[model samples]
Target: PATVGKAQYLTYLAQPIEPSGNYSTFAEAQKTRAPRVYVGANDGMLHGFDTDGNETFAFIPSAVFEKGAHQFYVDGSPVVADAFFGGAWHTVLIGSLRAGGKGLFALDVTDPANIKLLWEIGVDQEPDLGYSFPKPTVARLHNGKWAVVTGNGYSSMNDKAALLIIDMETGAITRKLEVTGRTGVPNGLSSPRLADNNSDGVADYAYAGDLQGNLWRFDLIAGKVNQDDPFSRANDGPAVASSFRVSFGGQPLYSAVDSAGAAQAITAAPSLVRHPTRKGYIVIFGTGKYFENADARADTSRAQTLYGIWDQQTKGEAAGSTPRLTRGNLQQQTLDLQADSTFASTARTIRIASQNPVNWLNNDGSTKQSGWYLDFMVNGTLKGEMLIEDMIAIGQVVLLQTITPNASNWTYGLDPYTGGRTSFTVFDLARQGVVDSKSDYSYNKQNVAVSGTEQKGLGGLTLSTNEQGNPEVCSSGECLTVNPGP
Candidate 1:
């Protein structure tokens, strides 16, 4: 069933039928001979295509309502984060959104042609009698069940969005854990990437880079649902009675880890995979430009493309530390002052001599306020882009007048431009023990000037690309790009 030159391609497999709408993304059951493909559209119809591009089954909940299934549009490509073939059949779990619908759905694909209605659960219902929308994602549990998790995809009315886990088998929601200390805004959970940090293969830990730029992680404690927050105290935790603010952007996206236990974003839509038979090894691809001409005088709503990989669990420690040093605390500032207007200058300086003097970007700051609008590159090649809308600064830095925010100074992770205490630790003047302001902060300087070996905050493979250029992943044969043309 394995094809020659196949990195992870399957032979004799059924591809999605064209016009049925090609799959924007595909994930194979790494441990299976029969691969299942999931495809959908903003029309809100998701179909499971076979190896021959034939529709084995389809879920048209919007169609049942006689409304166009326009909500299932693949804003981001669909990912089969985790799946398993069990119960004497293949049960595939997919993550998609329902138009004007809330929560995620777990459709049973035991009989591809005649799919079974396993369960339909909602994460956020409308307030005082309004309709709610769904923010679903993907994940796998050790209990032999794949999960369709939900978050605050839309309607950030309150800090109500949480992680809702549905039993992949019975289609029943087995657990719903609210991300403590974090607010739930619309598009809060774009794509929830999972990893088995403990090497249990069960993916005990889950990370979701929300659209608001908040990167969150929830530990699947023994696969049992815990009402309280595991990362902090139940009653007094950041997300306790009220939400504690985690750092991210107005457009947060995908996240990844390297061999050194550092976490960062993919910066753009990518095909991520673990290296076969290789530990702490992974591959990512499909990098492009986000903003065609971000250097222009006016704001360009255009977004660039990106893609790249990260070596996780490799042979070293992560680069930076969390709660990065802060220079000022703007817990509350005038609307104008809070605006990231200062970022337009090359060396804008701000006074932050207070405790946790955090500043939030104005709702209309666009890319200046949102991290998701930006892209990242490595060694002159585009790797990925930022997934969140607003970006935040954590560490303390002396304001050097009103310096314009340099695009190169902010980008990170050789690929897929990720922000905030990311796993990719870039060596600044401080890292080199040289506090001089005249140092060249380019990739050539940081990556080569230093040893480029594994250090306390840097290690594994250091990827480099051009400024926010998109790169291609390795796919062929059964492993092909799921190009769903617009």
Candidate 2:
């Protein structure tokens, strides 16, 4: 029998957070010594597969009782983070139910032998909370607390968009930042990624996208946090500096509207990358949807897009000025297809037109492109490519994965846009252009299981070997390489 584990999620927790601040006591930590492999199955259990492929244990949430038939139970991905609680470091795991239920749960896995179920919450308990679609994030706040932060998912009783912060220690719902009476209706927030500017282990900013294609940047803490006294943390509020903070706003700083001013749909979590040479950060995400029955019909009318928006993080909101950088501000890169007679396995190679170098500074010396974008359209064919998963960013290379519904020539590669297969578009972040020699440029259609390239921290794409052997597109042995750039 074939396995219907298409939506299975697997997370391996190997190296835990270091307590010595400088990571001096990392290897000696008992919490990280024993690695665990956690995978969520539709079989209603969070299964733990040991190193030897044996089942160690299975976790069943109380809310996820028998649904009778084969049902989606622990279908959401789980995130593991190390946070200090009661003055001691403990490893905490938080997970959503995805479409399985309208709830989420947390567990203390500091010790594998003594796993503790912290808490679980559902829509019945919290009125505004929706389906647990967005993955939860753990961030230690400047207010001396560790909390799980995420947007309240779509289809809640309240039907409002907001950020939910939960106390990791006590499993309490700490704060619900709601954007009361916003423009977009029936909206839900996607996954949120955090930014640590000063690197003090505390998150300074949070960036997330909503279902309505709105990108939000949240100022979590002040830049001038008073480190001496915990009570005086907010004393330096409104400090004027390059890293000044703003009061958290309900409305998104910018909405992703196309040339027709039509708002797109965003379902995947964004990837935040530091501008290797600039002062700001790059907020990158793709626009598409796989949430509804309509989303699976392979509609080719809407043109989805992948964007890399440059955020200075300095918000003055000048009068009469637009709130954020728009698509008009970004330079659009053209996509081209070329015959690749070099490889017998590939019919054609997907190439990015890269003659012009992006001028960071304009003629008057003002900033040039606010960032850049690449459309999922297959040029003349009107084929709509949809990006619906997390993008993997490594040093200079950023891998973009896309899916084209009902594409015709699956073997001949590029043809009609309705081709039903996944494609990879790997490009250099700094250049905003071509992916160098190491890339597997040829279009390999007819596959959908392996995403843009399964990746870990700083790891390069685990793609197949080319004619030139394995391209060193990543690090040496362990792909934790960070190339310094401008």
Candidate 3:
């Protein structure tokens, strides 16, 4: 019999993530891909729930329970994918304990009924390991090895930032590439987003960021350890070979610079998407931190910005020390609070800049603007907004959600649950222009009940009755299309 307090589950959980099995045969393997909904709760365990909303199992990392969890534990999102391990394909689960402890744990969930722990690692094993904040990514390397690519999270005892690629079966690290040069702050790398340009199931590049506002691009293929001759450094040469080599993978491709003197931390992961009508890719991310002790209400005059950088590949060009695109080289989008006559409230305008295309060439055989940026300031007044969520990109439409926090204050104990509201912004993933009109989003009070692009002039909405007989906003279609998987 468990006591109420012992079984208490704090609500501050990580992202709701799902997993699946290998789909070598999609006919019957469909159910294997989505078996259950996994969530890491503050209770120092990752819980798996069934479709009927019943608790199936809970996984507790040894590092978490050993450290004696009082605050954040098991708060990191776990990455699950169908990986070729050992001799066959298995659904693998790589769990990182962010803020809970300094390490990671693996689980073999190929058959949920027979799930078993694979392995675990932490500061005791690897000194360079940090808080395990970044979500781990699994991909197939060029060497035909299935690996999990993860950033050396924060608070490392060695005070360094690095990325570790580990074998999917053995849990042995294949390679660890460190990002040299730091701002001398408490450094930690954020989550990494992998890209497979040819979609051949082999990862070619990875994009991530650090606490110092430095966005990094890693060459997954070249960063691997030498297989034949492990002695001399052959593949550890220039990142991109051309007339002139720009910053390497370890060297930052773009670093966020705050001229207003406020701290800019790239705590959030960069969102990766295919370039629209182009040859390269576009990296989207925002700047701001909400993981520090003083972040409860760390007010600053500087505005947190959302960037849509056109990360087009450049070769035979003389770019400077780092391949950073400043505001001068890109288009800027303006946010205006428009009057909502329906709800008698104000909704932010979605007017973005265009015509001034991204500068592709400086005429010096170098590169120029590849995308655009938009600040989260409404008419010069900072709304205390910060981006803590990953962006969602479907086709050409990209949706972003930001949070505006109200300072956390103690109110007779148990008031640390500070409040905040979220704002949704839609734009063209390729053009960085507005998606639709502001009214399509402002579904009266909360905005956007139904929105998308069906044809040149296709729009529809259906308001139904709720429990209170109020108008219910339903986006998409009147009927919901449910995926067969989880």
Candidate 4:
């Protein structure tokens, strides 16, 4: 139970965020000019709340556009566009939870009281819907047009999702092109599909990193028409799927690939978060050391092991053996640990590599100064870089700075030989801030350690709610007044 007392008003309880019970997935929050928070729910509901937490409107359809037998849910963030037929509208693009289909809904929010549905586009299967299984993104094009891009998946429509340019005004698709794939996995599936470099408020390029550490770019603004065939380029040496990119420090940076033949670094179940105030971005990726699969082995001691050198061809027992690294005339023998099956393997590798004893192994720039830009590489190959200014772990925000100042904004080039290249770099980022208490990343560190007993109570308490529905001090209690006196 939360203690009710003085000074409590200034002390909010730190608790895990519970699902609002209505939405299926909370991909990310989109900032709208209306001051209303528009959140997409898994139940196919577009929930809108004002800054004061009032339910302004709930766009609940008795039936969604692409509803099927299973529970069809929305998984991605909704993008609101100012471009409409005549009135101001908000476009909510959602990822389908069940089938290979996603939907885009347009709401006439000019009159928030009376929201009208202008049109809806269903990204069904290609040819019929063109692209299915959409982790959607909506952006305003350079020509003042609105474009919808989806992070296509293999489960929904096979590995054949090309970037599609849809003209919101006409409710018609203006562009569609193929993304390269040697077999089942397409290049787009390996990396983050949507990137808005040039920050033209428009998404012009589609990036995908394959299993071979190859990064492929698709030009979306060129109308998805007779553009390039989505060629493959190298960034880092033999890094799988580090081919993905995310915008940070107000610029884009590529996540470093894990050389361990397993996903790790900011690329392992990777995600990008922008600092609330500063000008940079934060790329996060990690994996649990305990989890394992049939193919995954856990010699936790090697958790900090680096991929000495990888020859993707050799697998099975031979792949587990040690390799010889030749530096000048000196030969160093290093063991090759098999890759972990955990989702955060790459992220963990990045965290480890960034903290190693070597000087260049870690780059924090100067905390004394606000903004800092630094590039990172492993064994001469570009792993990842960052341009971080200020960071708020509790607030989940980062301030940005210039990333690869000379190169394209939010753009990264892959390197084929060593599997590393000159790409957009990451900003100052660390996984330590999220802890309820501060803790260094040490094997025996106990900074954020949670007692086994506290873990149980962590679930039941809600941080902000009450019966009268007024903002209060308790995770659910009476409002605590801060000012003293009777």
lDDT by residue for model 1 over 350-413, one digit each (tens)? Answer: 1111111222234763212111111222222332222222111122110000001122112122
Q: Candidates ranked by TM-score, best first?
A: 2, 3, 1, 4
Query: Which residue segments of model 3 deviate by more than 4 Å?
Result: 1-22, 30-34, 68-74, 223-250, 259-263, 314-324, 338-368, 407-486
Off by over 4 Å in 4: 1-35, 49-56, 60-77, 81-102, 123-134, 142-144, 185-204, 208-215, 220-353, 356-486
Clashing pairs in 2: 277-486, 406-418, 406-419, 407-418, 407-419, 407-420
Number of the top-ranking candidate, with TM-score as the measure: 2
Model 3 poorest ten-residue lDDT run: 410-419
Q: Using Cα atoms with residue i matched to residue i, what is each candidate's TM-score against the true structure? A: 0.43, 0.71, 0.69, 0.41
Best by lDDT: 2
Put down candidate 4 lDDT per residue, 52-111, tens digits, no spaces: 768877675434533510111112234453332332233333323212234445555534
Off by over 4 Å in 1: 1-37, 48-57, 62-89, 98-100, 123-138, 142-145, 156-159, 180-187, 222-486
Candidate 3: TM-score? 0.69
Query: Considering lDDT, where higher is better, how would the candidates rank from best to worst?
Result: 2, 3, 1, 4
Which window of 10 residues has the lowest lDDT sum in candidate 1?
Answer: 396-405
For residue 231, give model 3's deviation from the true position in Å: 24
**In candidate 2, residue 388 scores what lDDT?**
61
True lDDT of residue 117, candidate 3? 88
Each model's lDDT comes to 0.31, 0.53, 0.53, 0.29
RMSD of each: 16.6, 9.1, 11.8, 17.1
Which TM-score value belongs to model 1?
Answer: 0.43
Candidate 4, after superposition: displacement of residue 468 in Å?
Answer: 30
